[PDB]
Design a protein around this ligand. Structure first.
Ligand SMILES: [Zn+2]
Ligand SMILES: [Zn+2]
Length: 98
């Protein structure tokens, strides 16, 4: 005879073990979310990554804890681009009839 029962605790194993150990499990990325950091933890991270990546420059790859601050820096350090967007705009017509 061969068998084996299963039992997947859930996506709230490491985020929970810390809730009863230290207190709450805030976002390990920005560290900002609901008070229970349980429901607003998975629903938040959704954009978290989307935002973090954005704020994080590409030419320098520096993290900025401020959207407005990044805009300034970008231009400040990275004002001009090492590549120009080819200017190829043609093909026009003039429809005229009754
Ligand atoms: Zn986050
Ligand atoms: Zn930069």
């Amino acid at each position: 005879g061969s068998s084996g029962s299963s039992g997947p605790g859930g996506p709230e194993e490491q985020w929970q073990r810390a809730i009863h150990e230290r207190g709450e499990a805030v976002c390990p990325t920005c560290n900002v979310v609901t008070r229970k950091t349980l429901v607003g933890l998975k629903k938040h991270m959704e954009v978290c990554q989307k935002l973090q990546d954005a704020l994080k420059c590409q030419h320098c790859r520096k993290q900025f804890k401020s959207k407005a601050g990044l805009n300034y820096h970008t231009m400040a350090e990275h004002s001009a681009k090492p590549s120009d967007a080819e200017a190829s705009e043609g093909g026009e017509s003039g429809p005229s009839s009754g």
